[PDB]
């Protein structure tokens, strides 16, 4: 109901792709595949001990969508989980197409309360190709 303070997301690229596909590589849960048509959804919940979140992201030989939104819940844990296709929701990235396959994509966004991000990683528009994207999240202070 009450109207929340939102600021803007920093969103930055960084050409060491390889290296990037490399480290994170060394989580399996790090890596996911997103099917044809399909999307995927990253819930990532704000921590008590946090003010911002980060995210990076990467794939192989196709981009794939990629938006954030913020959804006003209070979660019992902290713990990421991954979902494939009453709560508010603002948006904080609108879902764009990314082409994270050439660079590695980054941003961060400051808290603007308790809630639960969602990453979305959309590939709705993709008639035959699945994607692996290579993630990582965390919280800073």
């Known amino acids: 109901e009450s109207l929340p303070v939102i600021a803007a997301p920093s969103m930055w690229t960084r050409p060491q792709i390889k290296d990037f596909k ?14 044809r048509g399909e ?6 919940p ?42 508010l929701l603002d948006e904080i990235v609108p879902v764009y197409r990314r082409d994270c396959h050439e660079e590695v994509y980054a941003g961060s966004h400051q808290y603007p309360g308790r809630g639960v991000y969602l990453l979305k990683f959309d590939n709705s528009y993709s008639l035959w190709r699945s994607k692996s994207v290579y993630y990582r999240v965390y919280y800073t202070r």
């Not at 999307?39 to 990532?44: A, P, Q, S, W």
């Open 22 to 35: 490399e480290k994170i590589q060394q989580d399996a849960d790090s890596v996911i595949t997103v099917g």
């Open 46 to 87: 704000t921590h008590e001990e946090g003010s911002y979140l980060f995210w990076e992201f990467a794939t192989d030989n196709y981009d794939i969508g990629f938006g954030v939104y913020f959804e006003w819940t209070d979660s019992p844990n902290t713990a990421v989980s991954v979902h494939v296709s009453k709560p």
């Open 39 to 44: 999307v995927v959804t990253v819930r990532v």
